[PDB]
Design a protein around this ligand. Structure first.
Ligand SMILES: *[C@@H]1O[C@H](CO)[C@@H](O[C@@H]2O[C@H](CO)[C@@H](O[C@@H]3O[C@H](CO[C@H]4O[C@H](CO)[C@@H](O)[C@H](O[C@H]5O[C@H](CO)[C@@H](O)[C@H](O)[C@@H]5O[C@H]5O[C@H](CO)[C@@H](O)[C@H](O)[C@@H]5O)[C@@H]4O)[C@@H](O)[C@H](O[C@H]4O[C@H](CO)[C@@H](O)[C@H](O)[C@@H]4O[C@H]4O[C@H](CO)[C@@H](O)[C@H](O)[C@@H]4O)[C@@H]3O)[C@H](O)[C@H]2NC(C)=O)[C@H](O)[C@H]1NC(C)=O
Ligand SMILES: O=C(OCc1ccc(OC(F)(F)F)c(F)c1)N1CCc2cc(C(=O)N3CCc4[nH]nnc4C3)nn2CC1
Ligand SMILES: [Ca+2]
Ligand SMILES: [Ca+2]
Ligand SMILES: [Cl-]
Ligand code: NA
Ligand code: NA
Ligand code: NA
Ligand SMILES: [Zn+2]
Length: 806
């Protein structure tokens, strides 16, 4: 109950929320059905509309008006945004040439440049080019400020997960808003778009920007707007807040538009009905910028124009139905649409089996438009697993499609022509970023980046220390004129050992064999140097990775490759090698097919053994440095060392062998040499972070050889590809992957065919940032380059998406 008989007199859009049953006057009171009786009358005035006219100029103040054209309005902070244009002969902001803003130009008493976040729902990245004719205000922000060709949203590419990611810097799995709809099994409560439960604070994890600001003594406007408050009123409220006394005036503000998303759902992303919504958004931006100019704030405020996600063409007829796959359809609950999430309808049903459900949904129809996954097998780049609100069974739905349980769900629950929620690498889901103000750069284009990075930057803009988050602080320093964040490289925690020859062959009883006993100061002085690290400069181009946790490991040097070998996990944490454009692929000689060789630098007790692999009927092995790429027949013996060996299922060896035999050479040809760092990843609890030894759920049968959940590779070359990878004077180019180490290839419906028809497609799906690999390994790469650290952090956050041009 609310005692709605209080009054909003002088309280309109109050910044502090009053505790019920006292009636409210803040911009959210409508949503809670809690506004005072006179809120509409006093706070949502519409009389005379939103614009000054020639004859309204100089008028006598009439408090009933929506905005004012009287002489006193500027000091009152409540003129219509076009007052000075109409009445004082000013130009609109958009008609003014842009001029570099080298310093904040602010009224006296402003302690810092305010930040205004202008967020647009469903604003697809290609609207910037495609709608540019009808968006002159936005086009001026974009060309005069700092802009990216697009910004990558988080998965799922829905509204709430993305807006909350913008506010927190966290993946949805960490912030807890994992969809627009959710069931939390611990609360036993459901979260929905409509309804009351979503207002409960227990759903919302991490620390959003307005809380970060408040705690650190920076005042914030209220970020959320009830839908029925028109856009013109949102703008005038912000402009009014900016006229408050110094001690009361917020420093950070947000505006939200439900457009163009709202019309996009109805008409598709490029429906002819989409032009009007883009015009209206531009007009709103114009109103803000005119209002700012009037207040002498247009060269003071930093403005961010940002979207939550794009919009794709999707129609009713493009729906897959689980009823065409499952016999047991009524025993499941599906969260439907542009993603699928499945759980048991009843926790009392002991005959529910996720394994049989997954199998029934796997590669069943020729052009099947969704792929089922256990959540821990989803591409690691989605970071979509580590939350109890994410169901074990997930469906990744093809762009342009929906999944639903039964046909009746679609026509008894065509309306829409657009939707979103798909994989966050999909071009149509990409959204926008523009930064304009004294703190952003002038007329600068920056590369695409992820929206998880923005929280840090908004903190930088306000002089705040960011709460712990998933951005990489410093990676967006190149967007900023000043207020950059200058991080230091993390300190290495464990130093390596550098073992020499310490064991005789006969001390090893590993069950391993090799036809290598076939016999000189030319070549023996030479081989000793290689084992002391003489070629290390060629194969370790960016310094050795730093180990950021406590462990015991050895550096092992070889002619063709260098490794950091873990005595704890009994295999390399990383193996580094360079393959020049000129390098040649050779085969594994017949006599060496099953050769595994003891490493006389590493004790038997810290080695793998071949007997375990023989005994384990499910597990085989592969090598991190590929024997195919040995520099000479004698160097090839090094690739068969037991310390270069790692556990691999036969199904996975198909993937790995093709990558090593074919793909590495291909990238070296195309990229003018590559440097490759490969290694294992252990993430049994799917938290995106390196597992400790006591977290490993699987070993090679009868041994302490732990089985990786994933295998990574980081592939680096010169951005200027006229320079060879090992002789690069400037910026680097990277692509990486984190391949799931699976005992079957069920994920690839074409896997019965030649590796050339399905393996590269698998790898592209499992594309990754170096940063993702750092989290998963506790390693820190690119420690020794001639590049600035900020540039390297940008490089580490890069994602190669394999999408065509936006
Ligand atoms: C992306 O960035 C984020 C932010 O940096 C990273 O997430 C952090 O990861 C940390 C390392 O895992 C984690 O640290 C743990 O915190 C525990 C206390 O956490 C509470 O307090 C913080 C601070 O205010 C708060 O943020 C947390 O909020 C979480 O939980 C609530 C309620 O569930 C949610 O509302 C909220 O959304 C958020 O949930 C998310 O995180 C939790 C994990 O905390 C997940 O379970 C959820 O799925 C969701 O993703 C909390 O309110 C602290 O107790 C931990 O310490 C235990 O574990 C360590 C192991 O190192 C051990 O040393 C300790 O002894 C202790 O163990 C004891 O408890 C164990 C479990 O009960 C038990 O097994 C043992 O036997 C012991 O009894 C730990 O320090 C930190 O909380 C999160 N922060 C956030 C915001 O998520 C994230 O890793 C980044 N991702 C990537 C890929 O880089
Ligand atoms: O005013 C608001 O939010 C401001 C804001 C702006 C920016 C924020 O973060 C930032 F500041 F960091 F950017 C930041 F948290 C918060 N909101 C939240 C967004 C929202 C969603 C809906 C909604 O019902 N749908 C969404 C579109 C859609 N598509 N398909 N189905 C749907 C259903 N209504 N609203 C209005 C109230
Ligand atoms: Ca949205
Ligand atoms: Ca882990
Ligand atoms: Cl959802
Ligand atoms: Na031998
Ligand atoms: Na085996
Ligand atoms: Na298959
Ligand atoms: Zn939408």
């Amino acid at each position: 109950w609310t005692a709605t008989s209080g009054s909003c007199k002088g309280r309109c859009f109050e910044l502090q929320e009053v505790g019920p049953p006292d009636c409210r006057c803040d911009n959210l009171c409508k949503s809670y059905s809690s506004c005072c009786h006179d809120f509409d009358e006093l706070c949502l005035k519409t009389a005379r509309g939103w614009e000054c006219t020639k004859d309204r100029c100089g008028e006598v103040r009439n408090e009933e008006n929506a905005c004012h054209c009287s002489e006193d309005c500027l000091s009152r902070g409540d003129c219509c945004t076009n007052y000075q244009v109409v009445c004082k002969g000013e130009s609109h902001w958009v008609d003014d040439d842009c001029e570099e803003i080298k310093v904040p130009e602010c009224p006296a008493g402003f302690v810092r440049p305010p930040l205004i976040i202008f967020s647009v729902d469903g604003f697809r990245a290609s609207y910037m080019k495609k709608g540019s004719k009808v968006m002159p205000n936005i086009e001026k922000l974009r060309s005069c400020g700092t802009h990216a060709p697009y910004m990558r949203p988080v998965y799922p590419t829905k509204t709430f997960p993305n807006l909350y990611t913008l506010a927190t810097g966290l993946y949805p799995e960490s912030h807890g808003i994992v969809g627009n709809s959710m069931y939390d099994p611990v609360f036993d409560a459901s979260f929905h778009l409509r309804g009351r439960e979503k207002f409960n604070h227990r759903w919302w994890g991490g620390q959003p920007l307005w809380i970060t600001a408040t705690k650190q003594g920076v005042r914030a406007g209220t970020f959320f707007w009830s839908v029925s408050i028109p856009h013109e009123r949102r703008i005038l409220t912000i402009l009014q807040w900016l006229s408050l006394p110094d001690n009361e005036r917020p420093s950070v503000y947000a505006f939200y538009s439900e457009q163009p998303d709202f019309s996009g759902h109805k008409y598709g992303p490029f429906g002819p009905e989409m032009t009007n919504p883009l015009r209206e958004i531009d007009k709103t931006v114009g109103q803000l910028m005119d209002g700012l100019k009037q207040l002498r704030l247009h060269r003071c405020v930093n403005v961010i124009f940002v979207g939550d996600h794009g919009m794709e063409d999707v129609t009713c007829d493009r729906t897959e139905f689980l009823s065409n796959y499952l016999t047991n359809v009524d025993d499941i609950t599906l969260v439907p649409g542009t993603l699928g999430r499945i759980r048991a309808k009843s926790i009392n049903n002991s005959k529910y089996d996720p394994k049989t459900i997954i199998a029934a949904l796997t590669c069943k129809k020729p052009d099947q438009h969704f792929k089922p996954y256990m959540k821990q097998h989803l591409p690691k780049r989605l970071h979509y697993a580590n939350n109890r609100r994410i169901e074990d069974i997930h469906l990744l739905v093809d762009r342009r499609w929906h999944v639903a349980r039964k046909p009746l769900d679609v026509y008894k629950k065509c309306f829409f022509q657009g939707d979103h929620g798909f994989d966050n690498k999909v071009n149509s889901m990409q959204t926008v970023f523009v930064g304009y103000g004294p703190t952003f750069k002038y007329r600068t284009k920056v590369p695409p980046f992820e929206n998880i990075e923005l929280y840090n930057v908004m903190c930088d803009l306000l002089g705040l220390k960011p709460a712990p988050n998933n951005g990489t602080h410093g990676s967006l320093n190149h967007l900023l004129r000043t207020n950059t964040f200058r991080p230091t490289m993390p300190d290495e925690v464990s130093r390596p050992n550098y073992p020499g020859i310490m064991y005789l062959q006969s001390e090893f009883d590993l069950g391993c064999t090799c036809d290598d006993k076939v016999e000189n100061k030319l070549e023996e002085l030479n081989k000793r140097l290689h084992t002391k690290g003489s070629t290390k400069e060629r194969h370790l181009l960016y310094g050795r990775p730093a180990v950021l946790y406590r462990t015991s490991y050895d550096i092992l040097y070889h002619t063709d490759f260098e490794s950091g070998y873990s005595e704890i996990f009994l295999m390399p944490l990383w193996t580094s090698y360079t393959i020049s454009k000129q390098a040649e692929v050779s085969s594994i000689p017949e006599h060496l097919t099953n050769c595994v060789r003891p490493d006389v630098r590493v004790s038997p007790g810290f080695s793998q053994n071949c007997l375990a692999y023989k005994n384990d009927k499910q597990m085989s092995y592969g090598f991190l440095f590929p024997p195919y790429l040995s520099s000479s027949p004698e160097a090839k013996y090094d690739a068969f060392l037991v310390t270069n060996m790692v556990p691999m299922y036969p199904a996975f060896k198909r993937v790995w062998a093709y990558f090593q035999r074919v793909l590495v050479k291909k990238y070296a040809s195309e990229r003018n040499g590559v440097n490759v760092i490969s290694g294992p990843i252990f993430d049994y609890n799917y938290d995106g972070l390196r597992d400790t030894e006591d977290e490993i759920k699987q070993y090679v049968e009868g041994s302490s050889i732990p089985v990786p959940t994933h295998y990574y590779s980081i592939i680096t070359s010169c951005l200027d590809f006229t320079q060879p990878a090992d002789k690069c004077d400037g910026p680097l180019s990277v692509s990486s992957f984190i391949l799931p180490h699976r005992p079957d290839n069920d994920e690839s419906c074409n896997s019965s065919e030649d590796e050339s028809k399905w393996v590269e497609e698998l790898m592209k799906m499992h594309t990754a940032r170096v940063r993702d690999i750092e989290h998963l390994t506790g390693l820190d790469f690119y420690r020794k380059t001639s590049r600035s650290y900020s540039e390297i952090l940008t490089l580490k956050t890069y994602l190669h998406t394999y999408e065509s041009e936006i």
